[PDB]
Each structure stands twice: as structure tokens, then as C-alpha cells.
Amino acid sequence: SKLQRKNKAKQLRAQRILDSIENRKLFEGKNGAAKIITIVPLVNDLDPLDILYKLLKCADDEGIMVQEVDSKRIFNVHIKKFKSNLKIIIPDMTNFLNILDCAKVADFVVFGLSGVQEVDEEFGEQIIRALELQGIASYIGVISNLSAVHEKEKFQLDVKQSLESYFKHFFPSEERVYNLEKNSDALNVLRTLCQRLPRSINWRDNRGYVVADFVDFVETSPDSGDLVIEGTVRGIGFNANRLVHIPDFGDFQLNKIEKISTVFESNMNRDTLDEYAPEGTEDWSDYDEDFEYDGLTTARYDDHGFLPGREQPEEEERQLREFRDMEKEDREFPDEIELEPSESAIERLKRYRGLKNLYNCDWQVDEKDPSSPAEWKRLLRIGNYKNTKNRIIKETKNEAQAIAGDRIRMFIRFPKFLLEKIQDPKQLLFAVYGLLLHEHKNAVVNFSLQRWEQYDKPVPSQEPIVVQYGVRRYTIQPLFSQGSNSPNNVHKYERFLHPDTVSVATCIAPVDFTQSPAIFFKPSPTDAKNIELIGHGTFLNADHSRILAKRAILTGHPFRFHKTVVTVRYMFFRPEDVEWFKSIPLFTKSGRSGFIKESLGTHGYFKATFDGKLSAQDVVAMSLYKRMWPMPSLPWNG
RNA sequence: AUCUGGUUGAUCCUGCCAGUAGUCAUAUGCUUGUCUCAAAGAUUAAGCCAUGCAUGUCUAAGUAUAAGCAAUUUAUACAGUGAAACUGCGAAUGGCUCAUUAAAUCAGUUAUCGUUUAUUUGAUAGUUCCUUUACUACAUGGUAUAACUG
RNA sequence: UCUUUGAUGAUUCAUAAUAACUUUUCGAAUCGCAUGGCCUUGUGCUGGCGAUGGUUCAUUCAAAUUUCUGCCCUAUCAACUUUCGAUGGUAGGAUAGUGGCCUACCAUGGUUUCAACGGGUAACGGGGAAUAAGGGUUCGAUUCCGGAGAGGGAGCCUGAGAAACGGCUACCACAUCCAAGGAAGGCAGCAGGCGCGCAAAUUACCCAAUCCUAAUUCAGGGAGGUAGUGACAAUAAAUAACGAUACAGGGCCCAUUCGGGUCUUGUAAUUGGAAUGAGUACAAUGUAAAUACCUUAACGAGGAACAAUUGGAGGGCAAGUCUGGUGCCAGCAGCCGCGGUAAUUCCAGCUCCAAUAGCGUAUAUUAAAGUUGUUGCAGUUAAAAAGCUCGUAGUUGAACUUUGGGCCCGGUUGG
RNA sequence: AAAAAUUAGAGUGUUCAAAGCAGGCGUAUUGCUCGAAUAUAUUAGCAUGGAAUAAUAGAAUAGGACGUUUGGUUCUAUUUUGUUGGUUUCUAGGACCAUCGUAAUGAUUAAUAGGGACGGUCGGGGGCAUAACUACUGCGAAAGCAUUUGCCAAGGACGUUUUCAU
């Protein structure tokens, strides 16, 4: 008979309809749920407490809104209709930084709009562009009040269609805007947040994060006490083998874990709880790089060609006074040295490595470089960057000591000088983050630079700006490289944004295992909020094969052109570099090489061969290269 | 009330495969300015279902001491309005789907001298104290419970 | 010097009497309004309109059974039914009531080549729907009437009426809350779900209309109405119309020959002015309130931008002798086929053709099809007459039995 | 007598149309007024007209049909003997029972359908016993069928003023 359906049906789908259950139904509504809800107003004159009271009048209790009015920004409310509990938060618009993390704790973001204006670019539209570029879960756009447009009906219709504007180019994934003045539109905004949960972010999810409910200090010692933290664990958990960072306080060491309706402690398998770990000096102790410049006449290149020749409003003005001067050096003459020689040009700049080739030989990154500071010695370089990436993600679930959705009175070993600036949780959120094994140790890192939209003001490599990665607010001096496809990682050193191609930023900072996107902003009080949004990007890897370049190219005014000797004017008033740079072959900048043999005189006269035209339409050129290193970072607060 | 291309060097046939129009016949591709009229979870799974609604009802004329209101006044039984609750009636109509079912359903056609029927419309009831008026009310017999208080 | 008696085609029918019989049925211990007439004047006696209830006969809305004839493919289903009711007789039980409906004793019947009985159905039946010279072929889950069902089977309560599921109770399959003691559940009603697949709309406003229910004019109604989403289908029809010169030709004519008239175009980023709704929007009207359509202030074009699109250009089948690929970006277009450079088909530019809101492609079905043949095909050589004669059912079967003659009335037609 | 809707269709300026069932006229001053048709047995049942075509029954052993030929056997009592019940006399009124009378008493042809007899013949037809003639043509339902003699039965055609009515 025709039970063969119930064969083929109930034996095609039985496990494919099983892979997606408990992630959806761990939120059953008496004890096991906590839905985290954030509300962002998009104009400065809004009452989100009233928007809350437009979201709860349709909930069929009555005595929930009136007693919760005075000064509270965190709410925990149980919905006795769809049987779910919510965690309703609301930040403070006077600060900007608090807005940027109240999104990234949540999964549904209530986007309010305005029925009297449009959005503003630098503050509303940028904060929309802020959260989607750092990554966010799903959301709902909404309008609170539509009383202001005149009480005829058709005029209150089309003003919705105008407000669709920022969901045609921003998102082709959301077409409705719910009018909360309508009672029947204000209910399926309550249906969806009590009954769904979206694909959230990748990196914040897979590490564990708890929001605080009760924070109190207890005494263990006058050197260090303890803080009890009450909350519910989200993410994957918190175990006693690694560390925890909280912003504006930093990193602190736990002691014990207790789940209160499993008593755990911290073992002695801690990591190096310091900034500059002493486990880096017993890995590199070889004295085998001796590129020297103390008595070297010409850099030894005996493996690169010919025989050598031996002898027997007050903030902006200080920053742009030498900014646009480098257009002569970066853009119109990119390969150039500064020369108007009337001074003692016998010893003006000497220490160099002027080899001609770029991408076919060896260059020792590590040297005994006097430009290489004390970071270069006591640091660990675990140089395998693919298996160690995939090792750390596997071990974490195996050391599962805390499962998600638990009521914890979390204790932590904590000092005594930081018992003041933590406020009550009702006026400010308090969250923690699970820090992996050996992340806080500083090392070398590499970023990527996505240039900010309609902002072509470049920035040199000499500014310790704060770059947001993960949750960490760290000021850091960046240096910039290219991402050219070559099997040696010798790329071009640039100093600014390359306005055409996504640039690569080399840095020295603690490692980020989460592969979090990078955020380039400038803290300056020019804007009322202490942010100048200047860029964004992401982290890729930690590099060990970098060879940077420093250009200094001797070009000037040529006048004399013989087939073997070429004399160039305003060059040699003190001829020393012609006898100092024998094994650095000259070349015409039209792509034609040449040979330097001897100093034929004193004012530009040297032996110079030409491959093409012998005339003063192009200047013979040199090539110089050096190597220096970035500066480490610092955790920025305030 | 109509036919055209294809077997052979060339021709007449049997013969099928392309073509050609229609569909209140369903999907699908690219396009899309106006007026009138409008089908729409049937096919496959008569598979599973979060939340809210879809069945209640009073006149001058069955029962009011609301510790209801209105007070307003001819009214010492009550009389204005009128929650709750008992009693009466309805909930068997309507709406939705097409799984079963092949002399079954169902159609046009007969039969009840072979039966039940709220309602509606029209008729219809001096006889019934042991009595023809002898004890024992007909100017009128008896308990029990609801709402409500605690 | 003494009888009445209904109706039907038909009755032991209606209806009446006599003896009785019964856990003795019904025969107003209810309610609003009015307030009068009579008197020995006693709260004496009578007396109006109508609400609700009541037994039986008629009646209306019904219900339950029943008579005759009528269904798609299949013999690779020829014999089926009768212990355990199958066909009939007699007496009881049960029901609103007839009847093997059930129970006792007996008889041995009933269906079948004019297809019983069994198997398939991606089968609810009809009114009807598409195509059509005539005959026909293929559909009908779906606005009206009839039946069945409420996750799957069974059982009963209250009632005039239900084997009811927005009633209850059991087992079967499910699945919800839980202080673990227990307690609750049926979207094939309306909106809406996460499932499936080629495949199908809003958790909106109201009882104003249509009609139903209630103790009732007043309350109720996802029944039903109004909008949102809708290239499912069907009707009406914007995307330009008029001049001037100009230069051409044809053109009829003055033609002498010119130009004397009449024309027709052709074009001249040659030049002019008039018309108008798509759209916007004061008012009014619409409507239960609104939205839109009809009406109408002010606004609204050289339109080059307020800009039509799908498919083809050997043949069938309307449309090219056109230039470009080193075969950038070659099987190749339903079927004959075109490629081996430059192609009278691929890939692109230009110019033409067809429909104008494309019927462009896919899958079913109808005409074409006299290729299902009753109307109406095919016999030797093309697919196709059984090895041979007797013989079932089925179909088909010679001729013959009152014709002719005469008279006369009364129809509408050519007249 | 076969419901409405739909289909063919009459009337009717929704501004035309698909639709709808409306609408038209005066003084517009308290009004009169026409509509909402008709057709479509399309099996089976019901009422009715006609007697072609094609079936079916009737008298052959006459228990045949008509008769007021005559003898019977029965069964009913409506009526009158006011009336009532108790009797039978007729009388009508039902059937069946012999024989006595008159009608012209009562049987379709004999298929250039079929069967059955009958008379003279013909044939390598078949069974038992004891080549040449073979094509030009012989016989048998077919496959098939050749030396003479005799038995046993069968069969076509012809001939006929026989018979039965497939």
C-alpha cells in the first residue's frame, strides 16, 4: 500500500530537522531565557522611555510601566503572554562610546526614526554606518510618533515612503517600518522579538560573555580584594584557565566559579600575567646578522654582479605646516632625495643599503640593528601561523567548565584602588569578555586599511592613534605596507593611505585570535563626541617576512652627455658619494640601466653608460633602502 | 466545412515525425502609463500548529430590600433606572474541506392504507372535595436553594 | 295506520357504543394595563383590552424509509453467496414505524456470457465547462442544490431534533505547563505559523447594507460587507495632431516652354502658434468613517527625456546580394539542416517584418485526424482473412389477408 | 410536469463596451406611466392522436361461435305479508349441467429458399480382401487421392404435373 510516503517522509527528514532545535528552544519562559534588546534613537530629541511605553501598552498587563520611571536604564521584564523574558536596555545619548557597545552585546536592535525630520549625516548616518561595519545581528526599523503630520490620512501615508530611504541603499533586506501608534503594528513587533533569534556575529559569539546584575566588593587582602558578579553567561562560557578583560578597567584574574540555582576554583596553570613576557629571550640568541656601517665605504654586493672598486582652531594649524610639502617626495617625484647643495655634502646621510634587486634574494629581517629597540629580544615568535590558529579554537570547547545560561555569582581577584568608578548597573551596563590563552602578550601584528568614505585627508605613520579591535581600545603607532602578490613579503613602504587600493598596516600590539575587524578613529574634541571617524579595516595575520623600504634617490639637473661619461649639475660640490657608492649601479629613469666605473671629476663627472637616448630629457637615478620598526601599543581609556 | 516541410538521381503511393491556431489551464522569463470588473494553500502532506477572535440573549407584561445609583418625591407592601444569579429559549443554523465511497451516492420520477415532529396559523376543555355540596383553606397549601454576608 | 347510515380506485378508515383496566395523563394556586356600571353602600356584586401556559385533531417548516430506468477501465478476474442469515414461510423480541433488523423452529433457495463476483481509480455525484459543418472528444477539488467528515476507531448524556466534536467518556498516535504532588489539550471557521513542493494575499476597519437568532424595534454576529496585497482571467484605449516657407519630384492641367490651377508626398537639428491629461492639489461630493472613481480653483511639455516592449530576417512562414571574428564570445536553434577561414542562419552594428501590452518557452487536452472511422478508413504485391469443416449464446432472416368507386360540407392559399 | 444561475435570445444611449435590470414623461408646485418576456424531452415514467413498417395471439380429436332449443344444478333476497324475530311460496337474480336449431360452418401460396424421397448414370473419393493414361483435365471439408477382381456403405450434378411448409 501507499504508506510508502510515511516511509520516505519519516525516514527523508528526521535529522536535518534535528540540527536546529535547541539553539531555538533554550529560551523557554520561566527560568531559562534572557532576550537582550537595545533601542537606538536616531535623532537627539526622543523619549525612548515613551517608545517603551508604546511597546508595552499592548502587552495586557497594566502595572508594569508606571513603577519603573525614575532613573533606570536597565530593565528585566517577563512577558506573560508569549511566555518569555526580556532584557531591555537603553544607553545615554550624551556619551557616544557607550552607544557603540550597547549594540554589540545584543542581537535585536530597535532602530527608531523620526516623523518630523530626516537623518543627519555625521551623527545619525555615520552611527548607522558604524555598527554594520563592525558587525551586528538583526534589527527592526521603527517610527514612534506620527502625530505631527496633519490629521488627514494620505499625508500620513507617503511620509512612511519617504522614511524608506535609508533602507533602499543601506539594506535590501528589510522593507517594513512599523507604526507604533497603530496597535496592530505594535504587536508583531512584540511577536518577533519574543519568538525569534537571528544569525548573530561570529567572533563575539564563540568566546563567552556575561553581563552583570549585582556587583559588590568583598575583602580578601589590603593588597587585593574580590568582586562578586551576578549575571547570566552568554557565549560559550568562562573557565578557570585564562583571563577576562573589561574596558576602562582592563584585565583581572579570577579565582572561583559557583553556579547558584559545580563549585570550581582556579588551578595554578595560569599564563604569564604581565606585559612583556620573559619567555621570549630563550628563543633567539644567534649573533649571525652583521650588516655594518662604521667603516664600510660601499655596501658589499659580491654576490650581485661586477667586481667592486676600492680606494687606496589651534589644533589644525600645527599639523599642516609640513604636511603637503611631501607631495614633492611622495607623489610627483616619488623616488627623490632633497638636494640644493650649498652646505657640507660630504657626510650628510651615509648609513644605507643600496642594492638594486627587490624580489629575488634574501634579506635578514632580524639584525643587530641599532634602530631595533628592546621589543626585539624578549618576545615569543611562534612562527607557524596556520596550525596554531586552528589549535586554539579546538581546545576551548574541550575545556568547557561553564555552560551557557547559568546564574553565576562570579568572584574575581581584584585590587583595592578601583572600587570607585564602577556605578550601579541600573544606570550603566557592565559586561565582561572571555580572553583566550595568551592574547594580552604584545607581539607584531598586521592590519588592513579601508579608507573612510568621503574623507581623503591622509595620515602619516607618526601618530599613536586609537585603533579599535575586538573590544580593545588601544592607542598604537601604525606603519603602512602594501599587499602586493609576491612570494617573499617584500612590499612597498607607503606613509599614508593609498587612495586607490586597500592598504596594509604593520603594527606591534597584542594578538587578536578572533579575527575581529579593525576600526580607525581619531579621538579629538573637535566634534562634540570625542571621535573623528577616519577609517576601518580588519586583522589578517602576524608577519615575520617583512622587508620595508626607505627611498633616497640622487636626481637633479643634467647638462653634459657623452657616450661613457655624463656630467650632471648642482650635484657634486663635494664629490664623495661617487667614490663611496661604486657597487650601486646608476640607471636612467626611463627604464635604462647604466654602469658606474670611476669619478671622472668633481662636479658631476663620472663614468655612466646609457642604453638609449643620450640627452637631457631624463636624469640618471640611484636607489636606496633602509629598515626601521614600529612602536608598541598601549590600552587607551577615557 | 482550407492544409504546408521531410524517404528518391527523377516520379507516383502507404505511412508516421515537425509545423499551425484555441484553452474561465497552472507555473514561469523579460517588460508595465489610464478607467471599469475581479479568482486567489485545491493538486504535493484529510501533515503539524505559538497568540487573539469567531454564540449568546429582556420587553409596560416570570423572580429584585444590590449595605448600587438616582433623588425624586403624593404613595408604610412594592412602583425610577438597574449589575449578579435562578427560570425560559437558542447553541442541531451558518462557515470550511473533498479523505472515504462504483448500484452506494446522485439525478429526473413515485409511495406512506407503513411512521415521529419544538414552532407558526385555525379550531378545541361546566363533569376532577368522600362529594352533588357531611369533618378536612380557594379571599389562594408546603418546603428547599441561588447571587449576597462571614 | 313506521325508519337513519360519512368518505375512498380500495381498508379491520374516520367516528360511536358496551365491559372493564392504569406505580392515573390533562381540565390556568401565573403577569401588565386600565378603571367603569349596579345596588339594600357592604372595601357588596358584576365588568374591558392582552401577555404567557395547556390536551387532542388539522395545518406549515421538516425528517425516516421506498417504486421504475440510468455510471469510467479491466477475462493476465468464470463461476459467486449459505457454519458466523445467504433466499423464502410461521410466531415472538426491539423501534417513531415497515422489514432477517435480531432470535427460535422448519424448507433449499437466490445472482450469472444481455458479464454476476473480484481487481484498479493520482473517482465525491449533478446543474454545468473548453473545443465545435454535422456527428463527437475531453473536463467538472471550486460561488447553487444533495451527501460525507471534524487527528484515527468506538460509546453515550441533555433535547422537538445530534451517535454533535468552538458537548462529555475510554483505549490508539500525539504533544503543552509543573514548586514533581498533579492538571490541561484538537485552525478541513478568520487572520498568521517555522513544513512540503513547479505551485497560491493583511495577525487591518465596522455592523451602514443583505439576512439569521434571542424574553426582543435597542443587544450579538471573522456569516457577511469595506479596504491593503493581486500582469488569474475579461471590457473600454495615451505615447501626437495642425500651419508656413523651403527644396524636390510626381501630379492634374496654363502649357507658350513659363507655371496658370489642383494636388500628393519628400525632406529642410527651416519657423510659428493653438489643444490636452498622466502627475500634483484649495474645495465640494462620495462613505459607517475614510481611500479611490465622476465634477473643479491654482500648477503641469517641443515631447530630445513625460523617450514601448518582447521575438525573428535560407525553407515551412511575413521580412537583407549590408558591412565587421583569423574561425574574442565555434553544433547552431521544433523537424530538412547551416560549421572546416571571407557563412545570403553562430557572434555583434545598421536597416526592415510581425504582433503591441509578448502567447516568449514548458507540460497536459481539443481542432487539424476519414491517423478510431455509427455518419466515415484499410481486402493480392505496402501493418493486417485464423490449417479445415460441423456447431453456443449474440446479430440478421421471402411473399400474401379492404382495396377502389360515388355524393356532399367546410379550411387558406394562387387568385 | 423537467428549480434558479449559466447558453441561444426580445426590450433598454451603463458617455460607448463587457455588464446591469433598469427606466421614461409633465407644471416639477405634494404627479400620473410601460417593464422585468420567449425558446431550448435532452434517456426513463405519465396523458393522447394514428394503424404504414417489424413482432405476437386466435376454430383441426372442434370441450368452436351464435340461438328468446328445451331438461337442469345452484346460490342471493334486495322487495312487499306496518314492525320484529321464527318458517317457505314465488319471483327476480349468479354460475355450472345434457340435447335441439343456423350459419357458404372452420386448414394462404408451393420462393429459379432449404430438407426428404424416386430413376438411370459418373468419379486416381474411403475401408476390407485379392509407369506412360497423369493435362487438355477427374474426385474430396482440408492434408490429400494412380495394378486388376469382388464386397461394404457414403456423395455432387442432372431428370420429375411426388412430398413436408426447415
mmCIF file of C-alpha atoms in Angstrom, chain A residues 104-107 131-138 198-207 209 516-517:
data_model
loop_
_atom_site.group_PDB
_atom_site.id
_atom_site.type_symbol
_atom_site.label_atom_id
_atom_site.label_comp_id
_atom_site.label_asym_id
_atom_site.label_seq_id
_atom_site.Cartn_x
_atom_site.Cartn_y
_atom_site.Cartn_z
ATOM 1 C CA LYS A 104 27.391 44.603 20.346
ATOM 2 C CA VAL A 105 26.022 42.874 23.457
ATOM 3 C CA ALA A 106 22.618 42.376 21.862
ATOM 4 C CA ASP A 107 21.012 40.555 18.929
ATOM 5 C CA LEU A 131 27.550 49.364 13.589
ATOM 6 C CA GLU A 132 27.109 47.481 10.332
ATOM 7 C CA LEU A 133 30.802 47.755 9.503
ATOM 8 C CA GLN A 134 31.948 46.416 12.854
ATOM 9 C CA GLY A 135 29.363 43.652 12.517
ATOM 10 C CA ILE A 136 25.899 43.347 14.035
ATOM 11 C CA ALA A 137 22.992 40.934 14.356
ATOM 12 C CA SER A 138 19.486 41.683 13.063
ATOM 13 C CA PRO A 198 18.839 35.784 14.254
ATOM 14 C CA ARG A 199 22.201 34.804 12.875
ATOM 15 C CA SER A 200 24.390 36.914 15.116
ATOM 16 C CA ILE A 201 28.075 37.744 14.759
ATOM 17 C CA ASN A 202 30.834 35.145 14.512
ATOM 18 C CA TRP A 203 33.653 36.323 16.739
ATOM 19 C CA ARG A 204 31.881 37.662 19.837
ATOM 20 C CA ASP A 205 29.687 34.553 19.968
ATOM 21 C CA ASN A 206 32.374 31.878 20.257
ATOM 22 C CA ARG A 207 34.190 33.071 23.382
ATOM 23 C CA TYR A 209 30.440 36.964 27.692
ATOM 24 C CA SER A 516 37.953 40.970 14.603
ATOM 25 C CA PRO A 517 37.525 43.917 12.226
#
